[PDB]
Design a protein around this ligand. Sequence first.
Ligand SMILES: CCC(=O)N[C@@H](Cc1nc2ccc(C(C)C)cc2s1)C(=O)N[C@H](CNC(=O)CCN1CCOCC1)C1CCCCC1
Length: 192
Amino acid sequence: LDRKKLEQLYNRYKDPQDENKIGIDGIQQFCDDLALDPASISVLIIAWKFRAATQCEFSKQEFMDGMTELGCDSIEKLKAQIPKMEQELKEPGRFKDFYQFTFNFAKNPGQKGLDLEMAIAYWNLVLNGRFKFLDLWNKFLLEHHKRSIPKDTWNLLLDFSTMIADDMSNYDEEGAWPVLIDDFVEFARPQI
Ligand SMILES: CCC(=O)N[C@@H](Cc1nc2ccc(C(C)C)cc2s1)C(=O)N[C@H](CNC(=O)CCN1CCOCC1)C1CCCCC1
């Protein structure tokens, strides 16, 4: 890996007002160079591989360490990696890691939980086509005005989505389910 080539590539994205950070324009540019829409799951997958702390933020350390471990000193080398990252998420567990990372990436730094409509946005993206009851779930949350989602409720929603049946017949009340998922089963059962 040519470090000089990687340092100049970083210079293309860095904030004109802060050398140690990539700004909103630099994040947009990086997506454009990767031929990616900024609302694509592939942008979230890249954030996951670069292990970015929070959304709308990208540091020098994250970019440099990310590209080094991937062995990319160019955009074309990184674009060649995107189908390899998508393939790796076919593995449950790699997807569990990615899904759980999404909570920490989306929430505000300093805050322990994720705001409801922010969690719904990301659920719509990451649980797209892999949670039958997503429509009812969002409806239930927006209706019973739950302000924020706790880490364990977000995390156990994946366990719920992979274990639950179409009729919810295999759901166990005595199971280690958070009150929100448990209340959702009470609300949803008459509707299916
Ligand atoms: C789907 C991609 C994604 O998460 N996009 C984020 C913005 C990004 N931040 C980073 C940071 C680093 C990197 C590196 C390349 C690794 C990439 C990105 S893309 C977003 O707009 N996320 C929105 C929600 N956010 C918002 O609506 C704005 C949130 N505010 C911004 C100001 O500070 C407080 C939080 C999405 C839109 C798409 C569907 C899901 C909800």
